[PDB]
Design an enzyme around this catalytic site. Structure first.
Site, PDB file in Angstrom:
ATOM      1  CE  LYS A  50      32.483 -24.858  22.794  1.00  0.00           C
ATOM      2  NZ  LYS A  50      33.263 -25.865  21.997  1.00  0.00           N
ATOM      3  CG  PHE A  91      50.561 -28.255  20.375  1.00  0.00           C
ATOM      4  CD1 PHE A  91      51.346 -28.621  19.316  1.00  0.00           C
ATOM      5  CD2 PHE A  91      50.724 -28.898  21.583  1.00  0.00           C
ATOM      6  CE1 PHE A  91      52.284 -29.634  19.440  1.00  0.00           C
ATOM      7  CE2 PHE A  91      51.624 -29.922  21.718  1.00  0.00           C
ATOM      8  CZ  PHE A  91      52.418 -30.284  20.651  1.00  0.00           C
ATOM      9  CG  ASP A  96      42.701 -34.940  17.303  1.00  0.00           C
ATOM     10  OD1 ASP A  96      42.790 -35.985  18.006  1.00  0.00           O
ATOM     11  OD2 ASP A  96      41.621 -34.579  16.763  1.00  0.00           O
ATOM     12  CG  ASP A 100      41.714 -37.967  15.230  1.00  0.00           C
ATOM     13  OD1 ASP A 100      42.406 -38.974  15.433  1.00  0.00           O
ATOM     14  OD2 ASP A 100      41.308 -37.241  16.205  1.00  0.00           O
ATOM     15  NE  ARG A 105      39.597 -29.292  15.013  1.00  0.00           N
ATOM     16  CZ  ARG A 105      39.316 -30.217  15.933  1.00  0.00           C
ATOM     17  NH1 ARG A 105      38.503 -29.904  16.908  1.00  0.00           N
ATOM     18  NH2 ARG A 105      39.857 -31.459  15.895  1.00  0.00           N
ATOM     19  CG  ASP A 167      42.009 -41.122  20.618  1.00  0.00           C
ATOM     20  OD1 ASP A 167      42.316 -41.194  19.413  1.00  0.00           O
ATOM     21  OD2 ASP A 167      40.861 -40.759  20.967  1.00  0.00           O
ATOM     22  CE  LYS A 193      39.516 -38.659  23.375  1.00  0.00           C
ATOM     23  NZ  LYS A 193      39.139 -38.974  21.973  1.00  0.00           N
ATOM     24  CG  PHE A 232      34.004 -30.969  27.160  1.00  0.00           C
ATOM     25  CD1 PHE A 232      33.200 -29.848  27.047  1.00  0.00           C
ATOM     26  CD2 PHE A 232      35.065 -31.120  26.263  1.00  0.00           C
ATOM     27  CE1 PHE A 232      33.411 -28.905  26.051  1.00  0.00           C
ATOM     28  CE2 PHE A 232      35.297 -30.173  25.271  1.00  0.00           C
ATOM     29  CZ  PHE A 232      34.457 -29.063  25.154  1.00  0.00           C
ATOM     30  CG  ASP A 236      34.518 -34.196  21.065  1.00  0.00           C
ATOM     31  OD1 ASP A 236      34.417 -33.116  20.429  1.00  0.00           O
ATOM     32  OD2 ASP A 236      35.302 -35.110  20.743  1.00  0.00           O
ATOM     33  CG  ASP A 237      33.481 -39.467  22.322  1.00  0.00           C
ATOM     34  OD1 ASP A 237      34.354 -38.721  21.796  1.00  0.00           O
ATOM     35  OD2 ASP A 237      33.774 -40.243  23.255  1.00  0.00           O
TER      36      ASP A 237
HETATM   37  C1  1WO Z   1      40.011 -22.133  20.883  1.00  0.00           C
HETATM   38  C2  1WO Z   1      38.758 -22.154  21.732  1.00  0.00           C
HETATM   39  C3  1WO Z   1      37.921 -21.186  21.024  1.00  0.00           C
HETATM   40  C4  1WO Z   1      38.216 -23.441  21.727  1.00  0.00           C
HETATM   41  C5  1WO Z   1      37.740 -23.947  20.532  1.00  0.00           C
HETATM   42  C6  1WO Z   1      37.142 -25.098  20.364  1.00  0.00           C
HETATM   43  C7  1WO Z   1      36.877 -25.341  19.107  1.00  0.00           C
HETATM   44  C8  1WO Z   1      36.477 -26.638  18.772  1.00  0.00           C
HETATM   45  O1  1WO Z   1      36.437 -26.996  17.559  1.00  0.00           O
HETATM   46  C9  1WO Z   1      35.906 -27.456  19.860  1.00  0.00           C
HETATM   47  C10 1WO Z   1      35.571 -28.990  19.500  1.00  0.00           C
HETATM   48  C11 1WO Z   1      35.875 -29.156  18.036  1.00  0.00           C
HETATM   49  C12 1WO Z   1      34.046 -29.212  19.708  1.00  0.00           C
HETATM   50  C13 1WO Z   1      36.427 -30.019  20.402  1.00  0.00           C
HETATM   51  C14 1WO Z   1      36.141 -29.627  21.858  1.00  0.00           C
HETATM   52  C15 1WO Z   1      35.893 -28.064  22.147  1.00  0.00           C
HETATM   53  C16 1WO Z   1      36.619 -27.349  21.191  1.00  0.00           C
HETATM   54  C17 1WO Z   1      37.928 -28.097  21.153  1.00  0.00           C
HETATM   55  C18 1WO Z   1      37.075 -25.997  21.406  1.00  0.00           C
HETATM   56  C19 1WO Z   1      37.605 -25.535  22.653  1.00  0.00           C
HETATM   57  O2  1WO Z   1      37.533 -26.363  23.726  1.00  0.00           O
HETATM   58  C20 1WO Z   1      38.168 -24.245  22.876  1.00  0.00           C
HETATM   59  O3  1WO Z   1      38.574 -23.822  23.997  1.00  0.00           O
HETATM   60  O1  ZOL Z   2      37.565 -36.657  19.168  1.00  0.00           O
HETATM   61  P1  ZOL Z   2      38.914 -36.160  19.455  1.00  0.00           P
HETATM   62  O2  ZOL Z   2      39.583 -36.592  20.692  1.00  0.00           O
HETATM   63  O3  ZOL Z   2      39.836 -36.325  18.091  1.00  0.00           O
HETATM   64  C1  ZOL Z   2      38.645 -34.294  19.584  1.00  0.00           C
HETATM   65  O4  ZOL Z   2      37.731 -34.101  20.658  1.00  0.00           O
HETATM   66  C2  ZOL Z   2      39.893 -33.474  19.791  1.00  0.00           C
HETATM   67  N1  ZOL Z   2      40.609 -33.880  21.069  1.00  0.00           N
HETATM   68  C3  ZOL Z   2      41.876 -34.293  21.063  1.00  0.00           C
HETATM   69  C4  ZOL Z   2      42.243 -34.571  22.311  1.00  0.00           C
HETATM   70  N2  ZOL Z   2      41.226 -34.254  23.100  1.00  0.00           N
HETATM   71  C5  ZOL Z   2      40.217 -33.838  22.327  1.00  0.00           C
HETATM   72  P2  ZOL Z   2      37.858 -33.619  18.064  1.00  0.00           P
HETATM   73  O5  ZOL Z   2      36.582 -34.416  18.142  1.00  0.00           O
HETATM   74  O6  ZOL Z   2      37.868 -32.153  18.254  1.00  0.00           O
HETATM   75  O7  ZOL Z   2      38.750 -34.046  17.019  1.00  0.00           O
HETATM   76 MG    MG Z   3      39.916 -35.469  15.961  1.00  0.00          MG
HETATM   77 MG    MG Z   4      35.444 -36.196  18.739  1.00  0.00          MG
HETATM   78 MG    MG Z   5      41.585 -37.612  18.243  1.00  0.00          MG
END
Ligand code: 1WO
Ligand code: ZOL
Ligand code: MG
Ligand code: MG
Ligand code: MG
Ligand code: 1WO
Ligand code: ZOL
Ligand code: MG
Ligand code: MG
Ligand code: MG
Lengths: 346, 346
Positions: A50, A91, A96, A100, A105, A167, A193, A232, A236-237
């Site tokens: 996003k 990164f 992750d 995980d 992704r 975590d 995290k 936030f 995510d959870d």
């Molecule tokens: C790189 C930028 C576009 C950006 C992408 C994001 C892609 C993700 O997959 C999002 C999740 C998988 C829902 C995990 C939290 C939000 C994520 C990480 C996300 C961003 O925060 C973000 O700035």
């Molecule tokens: O649930 P996570 O913390 O592994 C995750 O939110 C990624 N993340 C890692 C650290 N902070 C956020 P994603 O659900 O994107 O795999």
């Molecule tokens: Mg993960």
């Molecule tokens: Mg998650």
């Molecule tokens: Mg994780």
């Protein structure tokens, strides 16, 4: 709104990011294949999300500098640092996804699950991290904020790694203790995290870029932004289990990987003793049979209704914190970022 | 000699490193378990090697500052930066052991092969990397070299990651091309993957600590030290196959992992066509049967005698480069580091 109009400009600047990262070692042609691999690493892992975090750097920057000081060079820097934050994200996500054991992704296969990559992804990630500092030196080496930004990006990485360590220590494979999964512990995990790097970092970046560098302005910004980042992560959870993987772009793993998700902590606060045991027997295991049982239990206790309630109360609280702590910053800074994560479904 | 007398002092300072890294987040008791894990990560992965790189920072520092400017604080800084270099090493080794599928390091099991760690090691490594910058800020934040050191450690990491990328692109699992394995390519790999961080970095660190920060002094130091680091890596490649794993502390993997080792490049320069094919059929594969065949071939072409010859000629060349390029630095700086890697067997 403000985010949505800036997206296109911001994404278009990625080409130059790549160019600058791939060119100024090509009077080092001996590394040429490594640099091609970097290109490919960037294209696969910086693009497709996003861009909220990087957009936050450009937006906040616009809103905090007088237009007469937004020369073209200064904008160029602002979206470079924008992109540095997206690279930090990239990164951590590449790493992750390996730790995980995730599959998708951003609606494609995780980098490490590509045929030809696997655990080489580890060095791929470290490279993404290095690029941050390459860009800073390129674009910001002669600014008075140069060292503030370097130290901010490093400290935000340490903090997110401390958070990652928490975590994973709370989620050993093959060890159900549900007793570990408390509110104290959850709040603490998500602070480190997610909350520093996704909320504090980008706004603080644009603060130092606009010469706003006092401890108390940062501390007050931080109070708002750590709390937004908590919310936030809870989103995510929730989305890990109850979201559309065609909208999120990623398949959930939290029950499988034995995670201290918000859902499990809530579950534990509500569960009858007989419920405690269904959770005990089914949680942190890879069998689909057993995961479905956990979800049914969560549903049985109306935890999607509890999520939708928590979202509502947290948002009011964040808004109170903005009323309290935004000054002298424009509230639009915080509001615009809040509006873009309210009721999100990716 | 100079290294050997300083070892004990240097190792004793590790306790304080740990203390300082584990204490100044304990009025953050919420992260307490993460910080315990850090302690454990450091103890397992920073300790047990020769300490040549960190000792190089302390030794060079002694030899380049006037004793009247070696106040106690200044020494404290010098061996802190010493330890920062050892942490960079630890960082890369923990990651490299995963990506090379290795079994032992420093005469114990690789961190990632410990029951209870595996791929969590990835975040463990990133933490080791963060600690470098934590220490620099703690001990060197108010020195005029602070930013020079930060940028040197970052650039040396980028360079070693570029080198790692080259190392792994030239060694895909399940793809024997022997055609990739040339001198140009080898020289280039080892420059980036070993030579910057193991030879340039520590000496350059002590140069900036003693206020010697001109481009030309660094460039000349570099000419010496990149060539020593090349030799060092060729030694490493020889010891991977022909060394005592009870002396090296690690089991070899290079033939298995399909690596552009020095031995294979030499082999290729000598091999009859029928030899080419034995190598083709046996290389880059995990079967002990087939690895033994490669070694027998290397032995058949007296490559241990070719190694012992190369060691001899390279050492003369390094010494010529010192005669040429040491000035105005004391030759002892380079000589002492050369003597400590001559004919090493770990
Ligand atoms: C790189 C930028 C576009 C950006 C992408 C994001 C892609 C993700 O997959 C999002 C999740 C998988 C829902 C995990 C939290 C939000 C994520 C990480 C996300 C961003 O925060 C973000 O700035
Ligand atoms: O649930 P996570 O913390 O592994 C995750 O939110 C990624 N993340 C890692 C650290 N902070 C956020 P994603 O659900 O994107 O795999
Ligand atoms: Mg993960
Ligand atoms: Mg998650
Ligand atoms: Mg994780
Ligand atoms: C940390 C410091 C003691 C240190 C340890 C080393 C331990 C190793 O295992 C060595 C090899 C495995 C032979 C690889 C090259 C030399 C190594 C890396 C080594 C150091 O260079 C070093 O400074
Ligand atoms: O052979 P590698 O490059 O993997 C090695 O020398 C480590 N290394 C990694 C980068 N530079 C050196 P080690 O043999 O210690 O595994
Ligand atoms: Mg390697
Ligand atoms: Mg290795
Ligand atoms: Mg080796």
């Amino acid at each position: 709104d403000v985010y949505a109009q800036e997206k296109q400009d911001f994404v278009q600047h990625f080409s130059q990011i790549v160019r600058v990262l791939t060119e100024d070692e090509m009077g080092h042609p001996e590394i040429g294949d490594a640099i091609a691999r970097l290109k490919e690493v960037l294209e696969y892992n910086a693009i497709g999300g996003k861009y909220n975090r990087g957009l936050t750097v450009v937006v906040a920057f616009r809103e905090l500098v007088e237009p007469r000081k937004q020369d073209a060079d200064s904008l160029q820097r602002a979206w470079t640092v924008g992109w540095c934050v997206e690279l930090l994200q990239a990164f951590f996500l590449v790493a992750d996804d390996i730790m995980d054991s995730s599959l998708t992704r951003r609606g494609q296969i995780c980098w490490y699950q590509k045929p030809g990559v696997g655990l080489d992804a580890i060095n791929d990630a470290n490279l993404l991290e290095a690029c941050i500092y390459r860009l800073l030196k390129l674009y910001c080496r002669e600014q008075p904020y140069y060292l503030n930004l370097i130290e901010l990006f490093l400290q935000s990485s340490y903090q997110t790694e401390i958070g990652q360590t928490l975590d994973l220590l709370t989620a050993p494979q093959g060890n159900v203790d549900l007793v570990r999964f408390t509110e104290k512990r959850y709040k603490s995990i998500v602070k480190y995290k997610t909350a520093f790097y996704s909320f504090y970092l980008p706004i603080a970046a644009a603060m130092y870029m606009a010469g706003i560098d006092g401890e108390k302005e940062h501390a007050n910004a931080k109070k708002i932004l750590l709390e937004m980042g908590e919310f936030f992560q809870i989103q995510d959870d929730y989305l890990d289990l109850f979201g559309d993987p065609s909208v999120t772009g990623k398949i959930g793993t939290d029950i499988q990987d034995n995670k201290c998700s918000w859902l499990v902590v809530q579950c534990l606060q509500r569960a009858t003793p007989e419920q405690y045991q269904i959770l005990k027997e089914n949680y942190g295991q890879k069998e689909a049979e057993k995961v479905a049982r956990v979800k049914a239990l969560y549903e049985e206790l109306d935890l999607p209704a509890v999520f939708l309630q928590y979202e509502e109360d947290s948002y009011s609280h964040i808004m109170a914190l903005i009323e309290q702590y935004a000054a002298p910053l424009p509230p639009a800074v915080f509001l615009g970022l809040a509006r873009k994560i309210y009721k999100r479904r990716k």
